[PDB]
Amino acid sequence: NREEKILNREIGFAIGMPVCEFDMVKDPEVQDFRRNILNVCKEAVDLRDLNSPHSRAMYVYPPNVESSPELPKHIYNKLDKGQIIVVIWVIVSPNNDKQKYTLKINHDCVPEQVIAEAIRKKTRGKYILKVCGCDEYFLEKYPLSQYKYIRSCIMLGRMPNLMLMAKESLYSQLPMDCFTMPSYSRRSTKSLWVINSALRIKILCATYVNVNDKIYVRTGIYHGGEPLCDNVNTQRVPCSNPRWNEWLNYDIYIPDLPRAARLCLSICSVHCPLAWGNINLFDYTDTLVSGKMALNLWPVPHGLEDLLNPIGVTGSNPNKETPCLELEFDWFSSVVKFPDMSVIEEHANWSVLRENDKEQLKAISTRDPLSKITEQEKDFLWSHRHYCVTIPEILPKLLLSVKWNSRDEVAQMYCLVKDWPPIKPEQAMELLDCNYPDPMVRGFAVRCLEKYLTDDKLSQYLIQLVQVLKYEQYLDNLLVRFLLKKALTNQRIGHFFFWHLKSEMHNKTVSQRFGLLLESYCRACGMYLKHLNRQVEAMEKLINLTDILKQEKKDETQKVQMKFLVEQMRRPDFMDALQGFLSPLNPAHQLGNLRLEECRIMSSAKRPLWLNWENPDIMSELLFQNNEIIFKNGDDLRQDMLTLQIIRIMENIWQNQGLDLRMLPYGCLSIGDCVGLIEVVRNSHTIMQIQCKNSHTLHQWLKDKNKGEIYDAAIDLFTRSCAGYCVATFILGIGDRHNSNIMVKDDGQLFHIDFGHFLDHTQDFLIVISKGAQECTKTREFERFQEMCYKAYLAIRQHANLFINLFSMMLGSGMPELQSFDDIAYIRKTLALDKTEQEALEYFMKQMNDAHHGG
Numbered sequence: 001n002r003e004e005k006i007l008n009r010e011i012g013f014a015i016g017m018p019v020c021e022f023d024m025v026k027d028p029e030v031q032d033f034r035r036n037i038l039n040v041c042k043e044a045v046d047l048r049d050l051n052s053p054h055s056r057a058m059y060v061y062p063p064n065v066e067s068s069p070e071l072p073k074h075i076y077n078k079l080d081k082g083q084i085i086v087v088i089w090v091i092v093s094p095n096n097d098k099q100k101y102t103l104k105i106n107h108d109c110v111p112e113q114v115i116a117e118a119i120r121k122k123t124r125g126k127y128i129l130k131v132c133g134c135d136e137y138f139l140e141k142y143p144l145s146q147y148k149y150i151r152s153c154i155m156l157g158r159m160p161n162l163m164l165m166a167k168e169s170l171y172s173q174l175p176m177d178c179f180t181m182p183s184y185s186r187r188s189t190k191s192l193w194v195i196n197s198a199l200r201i202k203i204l205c206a207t208y209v210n211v212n213d214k215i216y217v218r219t220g221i222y223h224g225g226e227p228l229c230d231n232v233n234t235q236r237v238p239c240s241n242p243r244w245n246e247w248l249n250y251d252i253y254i255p256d257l258p259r260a261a262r263l264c265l266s267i268c269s270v271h272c273p274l275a276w277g278n279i280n281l282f283d284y285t286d287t288l289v290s291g292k293m294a295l296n297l298w299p300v301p302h303g304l305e306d307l308l309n310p311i312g313v314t315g316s317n318p319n320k321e322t323p324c325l326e327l328e329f330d331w332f333s334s335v336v337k338f339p340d341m342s343v344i345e346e347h348a349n350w351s352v353l354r355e356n357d358k359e360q361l362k363a364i365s366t367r368d369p370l371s372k373i374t375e376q377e378k379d380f381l382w383s384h385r386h387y388c389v390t391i392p393e394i395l396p397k398l399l400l401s402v403k404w405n406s407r408d409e410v411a412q413m414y415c416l417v418k419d420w421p422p423i424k425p426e427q428a429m430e431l432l433d434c435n436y437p438d439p440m441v442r443g444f445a446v447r448c449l450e451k452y453l454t455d456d457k458l459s460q461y462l463i464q465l466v467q468v469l470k471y472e473q474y475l476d477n478l479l480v481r482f483l484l485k486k487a488l489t490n491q492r493i494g495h496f497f498f499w500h501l502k503s504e505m506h507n508k509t510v511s512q513r514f515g516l517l518l519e520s521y522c523r524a525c526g527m528y529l530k531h532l533n534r535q536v537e538a539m540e541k542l543i544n545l546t547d548i549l550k551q552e553k554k555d556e557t558q559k560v561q562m563k564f565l566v567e568q569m570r571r572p573d574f575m576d577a578l579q580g581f582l583s584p585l586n587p588a589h590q591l592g593n594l595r596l597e598e599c600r601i602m603s604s605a606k607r608p609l610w611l612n613w614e615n616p617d618i619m620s621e622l623l624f625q626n627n628e629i630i631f632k633n634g635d636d637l638r639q640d641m642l643t644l645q646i647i648r649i650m651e652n653i654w655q656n657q658g659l660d661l662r663m664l665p666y667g668c669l670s671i672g673d674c675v676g677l678i679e680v681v682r683n684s685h686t687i688m689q690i691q692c693k694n695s696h697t698l699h700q701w702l703k704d705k706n707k708g709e710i711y712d713a714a715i716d717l718f719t720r721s722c723a724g725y726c727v728a729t730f731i732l733g734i735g736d737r738h739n740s741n742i743m744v745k746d747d748g749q750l751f752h753i754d755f756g757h758f759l760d761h762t763q764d765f766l767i768v769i770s771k772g773a774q775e776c777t778k779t780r781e782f783e784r785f786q787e788m789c790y791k792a793y794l795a796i797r798q799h800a801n802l803f804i805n806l807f808s809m810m811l812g813s814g815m816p817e818l819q820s821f822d823d824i825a826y827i828r829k830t831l832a833l834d835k836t837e838q839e840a841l842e843y844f845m846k847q848m849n850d851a852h853h854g855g
């Protein structure tokens with residue numbers, strides 16, 4: 001009717017292509033995916049609408065809290081006998097008069113326990129605490145130290161500004177929104193293990209094979225990246241008539257193919273491959289493909305080594321002009337189905353010590369997921385299946401020991417997975433990579449993922465959990481139903497879940513899968529769809545604004561380029577879309593009225609856009625009066641977000657161990673095709689600008705801005721904020737540390753800025769470390785700059801598996817740095833976990849003393 005036709009237009013605006021364009025898809029899987037089996041996401045809507053409007057407040061404004069309630073030991077010493085001073089504001093007045101209160105509370109006070117003391121001070125479930133200057137609310141019962149804002153105040157010794165609002169005022173801001181089902185929501189066999197035959201797949205011809213010496217098709221059965229059998233060749237034929245009509249015979253027995261087994265295609269010319277394509281041998285209904293099939297082949301491999309592409313996308317190229325290879329897979333005069341779990345469980349049951357072996361299990365468990373496991377070690381893990389259960393973290397290595405060529409082994413391993421003890425979520429994430437493709441294995445991780453991930457940990461790893469959706473071979477699966485439910489229960493999760501999918505829409509390998517996912521999110525996200533629509537039109541206004549600035553690239557600032565930006569932002573169509581919404585880079589920051597005098601274009605080779613937005617809050621001055629965000633268009637920001645996510649994980653590990661590393665990872669998001677946003681850090685200047693364009697001017701600026709008892713802190717933190725970025729630069733192999741890539745805050749805290757590429761491709765810093773000494777090396781303060789570095793990598797080395805699992809997931813992301821696992825070998829190269837950290841230290845000095853010529 002009218003409302004359904006109305007709703008379907010902004011949904012197509014928020015995703016970029018119409019909803020009706022999904023109705024013309026002929027694929028039964030796509031239409032079946034959109035049907036009511038996936039619209040059970042109404043359970044998310046029913047959950048968030050259950051205890052309205054409190055549940056709608058929790059959904060719209062989810063708490064930004066910490067994973068661990070317990071405060072670090074060194075941070076607990078920053079308090080005053082377990083007390084934190086907070087300023088409580090109660091504003092009841094005609095227009096703008098504000099009342100200020102100061103409280104003496106514990107650091108772990110309940111958010112509604114602050115009200116009791118604040119009201120008691122005023123009067124020597126009615127109010128809520130909002131952070132002054134942003135839309136952050138203390139709605140959930142969590143310790144104040146657990147909340148990110150108050151803990152960050154203890155991080156830097158800042159003053160926590162919290163103000164009082166009546167809960168009825170926030171509730172009135174959340175009108176009820178209901179979920180309505182769409183039009184398309186209305187609406188024996190033969191086992192695979194009973195047919196005694198070998199796998200036999202016919203190659204007929206290539207419709208539009210890319211050729212301009214002979215052409216042959218290279219095929220192989222794969223389960224992840226390992227070969228499920230010997231690859232089978234095809235007779236070479238002339239390029240003019242690539243007609244093959246050959247029934248290739250595979251050494252793999254038909255009642256031996258695993259559920260996730262798939263056939264990989266490769267048209268090769270003599271031996272350079274021409275095109276690649278993977279075909280799932282089964283379907284989402286557990287049906288082995290039969291009859292004639294047509295597949296359009298993807299473009300020339302993936303810049304990889306071997307001919308086939310075992311890991312990738314299982315499907316036909318959306319472009320119909322791509323080389324199309326038609327195949328006649330099977331003909332058994334019946335419908336052949338992969339057996340149910342009950343048959344498999346009985347099949348496995350039918351078939352069925354304190355030596356160094358128990359100590360060898362621990363050694364294999366602690367090894368990193370790139371140390372190749374030898375066959376004798378793989379056979380070693382085979383015979384200790386009943387003992388590998390005692391060590392839950394051996395499961396990733398056990399799943400590579402089992403051979404998927406054998407029906408009895410895979411059936412035996414299935415019974416292990418169901419009774420396998422739950423593991424840590426960080427380890428369970430590796431089970432969702434390109435390897436480990438078995439649906440029971442792939443679904444085991446999700447069950448532990450949904451039980452042990454917190455909302456903030458999910459927020460840190462959300463960029464990783466999205467990228468592993470592509471490693472799933474079907475549109476409907478256990479992982480997406482976990483991710484979709486999370487996005488429709490938390491606005492903060494849903495905000496970044498939406499923007500991460502939408503950023504990956506220009507990629508036709510995932511546009512079909514992500515487009516269906518976005519539609520299921522946009523249909524049930526509630527009133528946030530119009531907020532998201534405002535952000536989408538605000539960003540797409542800037543995307544065309546930056547693109548039209550790229551037309552006049554050869555121009556200077558304070559000129560045609562600068563005057564075009566000034567005049568084009570005063571236009572009511574431009575200006576209305578560019579205010580009164582929530583910042584894409586932070587859902588709690590309202591990008592209100594613009595400041596045309598405070599928005600400019602940087603005079604750099606990229607020319608990004610400095611954009612300044614007022615803070616429309618009655619108490620905006622208590623945090624910040626303006627939002628500064630860098631909108632740049634032309635360079636990919638996916639590498640930047642990954643590196644900045646490593647920094648956050650790196651500093652969190654160091655902080656929890658009593659190492660007061662105080663590095664600052666600035667906000668970063670990717671919103672489209674190499675388009676993104678950067679959270680500006682104010683009160684910070686590039687070193688290249690500090691030295692106006694001598695090797696002592698850097699220390700002078702820090703000295704005159706910190707005079708008296710505060711001079712030590714500008715030096716105490718400068719050493720700690722420079723040590724953390726030298727280790728992080730070398731561990732991650734980040735590029736040249738240009739003077740323009742580094743900025744230092746007013747109070748000595750410095751950080752690195754141009755990140756991106758990594759793992760490959762008399763200093764004014766030192767005089768500051770020695771507190772202005774001419775020879776820093778001989779000074780005592782230099783030993784603190786080195787002893788703290790030495791105590792640091794042990795935290796990274798003890799937690800190197802996390803930095804490996806999180807890197808194994810971006811292979812299917814299109815980022816050139818992480819094409820293969822060989823690019824993650826740099827992590828174990830610069831950390832050396834196979835060695836001992838008694839001897840891994842010596843490798844670190846030999847690298848710092850070679851580039852810096854001693855020290």
Ligand SMILES: Cc1nc(NC(=O)N2CCC[C@H]2C(N)=O)sc1-c1ccnc(C(C)(C)C(F)(F)F)c1
Pocket residue numbers: 602604606608630632666678679680681682683684685686753754
């Ligand atoms: C996180 C961050 N904070 C900044 N702060 C200021 O620029 N400030 C802070 C106040 C004065 C002003 C200045 N020019 O001194 S810049 C910045 C940043 C982050 C990432 N890339 C960049 C650039 C400039 C290299 C790029 F590529 F975007 F153009 C900048």
